[PDB]
Amino acid sequence: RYDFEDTEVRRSNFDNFPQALISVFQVLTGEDWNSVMYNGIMAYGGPSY
Amino acid sequence: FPSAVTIKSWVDKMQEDLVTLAKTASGVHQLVDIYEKYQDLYTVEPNNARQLVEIAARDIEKLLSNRSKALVRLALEAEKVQAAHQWREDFASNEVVYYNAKDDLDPEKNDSEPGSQRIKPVFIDDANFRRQVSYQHAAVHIPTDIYEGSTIVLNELNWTSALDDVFKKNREEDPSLLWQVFGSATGLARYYPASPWVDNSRTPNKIDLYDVRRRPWYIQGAASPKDMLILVDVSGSVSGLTLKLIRTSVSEMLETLSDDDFVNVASFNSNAQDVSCFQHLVQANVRNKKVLKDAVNNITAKGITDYKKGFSFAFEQLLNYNVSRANCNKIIMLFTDGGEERAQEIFAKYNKDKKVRVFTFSVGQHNYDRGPIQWMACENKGYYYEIPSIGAIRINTQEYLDVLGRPMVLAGDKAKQVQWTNVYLDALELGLVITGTLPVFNITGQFENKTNLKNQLILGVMGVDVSLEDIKRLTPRFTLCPNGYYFAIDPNGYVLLHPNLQPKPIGVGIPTINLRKRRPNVQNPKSQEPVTLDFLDAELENDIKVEIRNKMIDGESGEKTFRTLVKSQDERYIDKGNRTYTWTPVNGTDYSLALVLPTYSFYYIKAKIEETITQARYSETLKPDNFEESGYTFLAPRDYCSDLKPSDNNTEFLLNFNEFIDRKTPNNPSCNTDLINRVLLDAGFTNELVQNYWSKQKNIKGVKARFVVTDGGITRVYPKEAGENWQENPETYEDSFYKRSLDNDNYVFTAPYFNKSGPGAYESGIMVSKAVEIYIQGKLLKPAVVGIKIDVNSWIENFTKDCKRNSDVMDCVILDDGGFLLMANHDDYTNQIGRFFGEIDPSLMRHLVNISVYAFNKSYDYQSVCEPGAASKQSCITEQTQYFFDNDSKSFSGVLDCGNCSRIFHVEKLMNTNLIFIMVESKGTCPCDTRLLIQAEQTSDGPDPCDMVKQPRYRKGPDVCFDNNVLEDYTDC
């Protein structure tokens, strides 16, 4: 779903298992977790209901 | 309401009044009399329009063969020269010295990049180039994203440096030659003579993004024409950054396509639909491509991915053979991200022998598997290209011509044929031009056939411009009248040479730019399209002209005479002109050349004056201090001698013209005798009128100004106060009224313009003109056009004395053909004079067309400018209406009804003139509108393309197509 029509690269996604594992570990250390969340929110339209 | 005989008798006393005022004050019969009184200052020679065409067809043959010889030698040198190049990589040790265009020429800069050394050249200013230029060496254009100093680029500037000696040998032999350029495979271009490029990279804030490979001239000689078919993956996975990239590649891929190339665009996601309205391969001209580039954009991606229905739909598209087709290289290119299926079965049958070529493009940053796509490309003798980025689009969607050029470079000498391009605006601002191209091949170790690994690509392409102003000097129109002209034509229907053709690019659609999304300082691309106006779009279309147009696309000779209607110079009138056409082929090329004449122009006047005193006496007639007894004289900016130049400030020009005859006798050993001489004879003919006739009747009452626009450029407005208001072009072969006066056998009235700026109404007045018409030995000639600006106030008084100056019962008006309003009874209408009558009472005008009193034809002007619409100027299409009498009948009675009211209008046409008189009941008695029928260049976006291409215009493709050599490498992807 991180398929936005921009040229900005989002290295922390959940495209496959290894990548998803890394992203979870990342949200766990709390390093840049808010940035990861923003992508997820934008993947569902934006800040709406 | 007065009876039909009362309007009949009252028109006949005010068309007898205008014509007597114009026959007497202008001097039609007097100027006829003095052309015939002399008989011996001139002779009457014929325009043999079989002969003239044949003569012209051969100067364009020899011009374009002379260009060709130069092209061949340059190519030979390039091939020979690079076969003896050593591929060095020590360039800081041995500098490559060259002059680089688009660099600061300031001496104090001294950048001095490694490997290279620049030149400061000296830059004389020039004519035939309207820019400063150096004839001692060739400039070099490197594109911007290409680094210079790369071993790949540094090694071109080494071997290509031997062209400056052959460049020089072409211009020494022929002074007139224009740009000479070698466009490199490497993307480096060298041209002679050297001049600074028009966009420097960073010294202004506009930056050029010009690539030689991208250029149309480079492309036509790179490779053979081609029927492509863009196949796009629109499955759900593509949506995202990748989908965004595809829409910009396909638009980019198209830029590459040409008129000779056919192309359609399909799209698949578990079914293959076709992106637009077309369904077959269409000509990929400016318009068709505009439709496809507008449907590629709206695509949405969803669903699965079936590489089997996408290539079935593609092959079927490739096999139509009912439609018009290129029939040359057949190739299909698919834009997609990753493929899990190779679709081995579809390729076995559809292309068992590999007739088709497949190119697969993987786009965006993604993890989908690329092995199957690469395999498809390898199997089909195509190529593979990745595109991750926007800056990667521009060199990969042009790069497929390295593959398509391969079976041309295996054809040998047979492939070295000069081809000439469609007219287009020059990169350097020269003007409209065509380029003849030849491809250079990479031959290294031919003697022994040693390598061939990279010997299947072209080194590059070589071109040489012909400017269209050079071809117009081989087609002289002065002997022929303003009506006569020469038209040149492709085997594609496009017009190489035409009066109508213009420098502005041909426009498509209604221009819409969004001001809310242009950040102020980034500099988008300007334009690159060729100026492809068609013969059936430069002139009003008939059915008896599509016969003429098809008959001279397939290289035949002939003549034709028929009655057709000429559109006027200004876009307001249509006049039925009995023309004769005559065409023949230019035997060296695929152009065929024609010539229009109007019967009566079959004879011209040559000046046969040679006496010392007679050429002397006629020459002080055009002296600006001597306009107190002659009339404000004008003079047309012909190229009389090579030395005195057309200046556009006419008092400037007439002094430099008339200085020239005093300071030197008109014999002038580098200057054509007949053109200047005819002018001198003419000025002694528009003198004896202005001396012995007009200066006798110094003030006629209703007459404002009196002119003789004549052939020899010399227009003479009679008082100098009046000559300030003379707002015409002083070139007599560009005046609109001059040309409408020659078609008609009756006095012609020209309506003044509505609104605008400058004094053009009460101050100058409505003008009447009439061509002079003499017979010498029973041979018809029309040498000149006399005239009168009328006084609009006086005319009103005669008109007033059942219509009152202020009448509420009924109003009456006089309208010239075309429906413009000249004289009005009310005084709320005569303020808006020279206005189209369907804008001041649109209800009556609408009815008049219905009665058959008026006829019209809407046309398309593909070269015009307009303001944008929100969705400084772009090019656009305008639709243009002109109105003209189609019914010869003199009177038209009737009544029009709007609903709940009747109005009884009576229409009478004045005999011997284009004017029409109509009497009708006052508009206020029936409150009616319908809608305002307006006649103007009206922005529009037609004709719709999807309906033209179901029955396209006839066309003839290139005879030689190079593709599918059996010994092609077909092993590199």
Ligand SMILES: *[C@@H]1O[C@H](CO)[C@@H](O[C@@H]2O[C@H](CO)[C@@H](O)[C@H](O[C@@H]3O[C@H](CO)[C@@H](O)[C@H](O)[C@H]3NC(C)=O)[C@H]2NC(C)=O)[C@H](O)[C@H]1NC(C)=O
């Ligand atoms: C409006 O109507 C008037 C009157 O018909 C018209 O008139 C000028 O009218 C006078 C009245 O007799 C004419 O004499 C005059 O014409 C000249 O003189 C004689 C008359 O037979 C002839 O040589 C010619 O008709 C003509 N030649 C001359 C005098 O050089 C006539 N012309 C002018 C302009 O004075 C107006 O022209 C009418 N309004 C217009 C101009 O439409």
Ligand SMILES: *[C@@H]1O[C@H](CO)[C@@H](O[C@@H]2O[C@H](CO)[C@@H](O[C@@H]3O[C@H](CO)[C@@H](O)[C@H](O)[C@@H]3O)[C@H](O)[C@H]2NC(C)=O)[C@H](O)[C@H]1NC(C)=O
């Ligand atoms: C590409 O660049 C190279 C490097 O500048 C050019 O090679 C150079 O060519 C000139 C003339 O062909 C050589 O001059 C000759 O030098 C020898 C002595 O070395 C002398 O005996 C000759 O009489 C003459 O002066 C020059 O030396 C040579 N440089 C090297 C390193 O070999 C080459 O000409 C360029 N190619 C083109 C197509 O211009």
Ligand SMILES: *[C@@H]1O[C@H](CO)[C@@H](O[C@@H]2O[C@H](CO)[C@@H](O[C@@H]3O[C@H](CO)[C@@H](O)[C@H](O)[C@@H]3O)[C@H](O)[C@H]2NC(C)=O)[C@H](O)[C@H]1NC(C)=O
């Ligand atoms: C015309 O074709 C010839 C070959 O038919 C091309 O010449 C080849 O150019 C390549 C460029 O990559 C040269 O390869 C290079 O070799 C050097 C060693 O000097 C090495 O350091 C590089 O890594 C690279 O491998 C190759 O020498 C040369 N081949 C021959 C036979 O000379 C030539 O490039 C083509 N013309 C143009 C204008 O491109």
Ligand SMILES: *[C@@H]1O[C@H](CO)[C@@H](O[C@@H]2O[C@H](CO)[C@@H](O)[C@H](O)[C@H]2NC(C)=O)[C@H](O)[C@H]1NC(C)=O
């Ligand atoms: C164009 O070339 C053709 C030949 O391809 C010329 O036609 C010849 O005309 C001459 C007389 O002018 C005849 O004697 C020949 O018989 C014609 N050719 C043939 C094969 O019959 C034509 O004259 C050339 N036209 C121009 C304008 O150059």
Ligand SMILES: *[C@@H]1O[C@H](CO)[C@@H](O[C@@H]2O[C@H](CO)[C@@H](O)[C@H](O)[C@H]2NC(C)=O)[C@H](O)[C@H]1NC(C)=O
């Ligand atoms: C241009 O106008 C002329 C009107 O004089 C059109 O010619 C007539 O066309 C109608 C059909 O529209 C025919 O029935 C008549 O026989 C035609 N008359 C003549 C004298 O030609 C002509 O069709 C118009 N051209 C276009 C493209 O609309």
Ligand SMILES: *[C@@H]1O[C@H](CO)[C@@H](O)[C@H](O)[C@H]1NC(C)=O
């Ligand atoms: C063609 O070349 C010849 C020889 O240089 C020259 O005499 C002739 O004028 C040239 N013609 C044109 C049209 O340039």
Ligand SMILES: *[C@@H]1O[C@H](CO)[C@@H](O)[C@H](O)[C@H]1NC(C)=O
């Ligand atoms: C067109 O040709 C006819 C027949 O030759 C001729 O009578 C007519 O005058 C010509 N048209 C014009 C406008 O002169």
Ligand SMILES: *[C@@H]1O[C@H](CO)[C@@H](O)[C@H](O)[C@H]1NC(C)=O
């Ligand atoms: C003339 O007007 C009538 C009634 O409005 C209409 O039916 C007819 O089509 C018109 N004639 C032409 C030539 O359009």
Ligand SMILES: [Ca+2]
């Ligand atoms: Ca942290």
Ligand SMILES: [Ca+2]
């Ligand atoms: Ca897919």
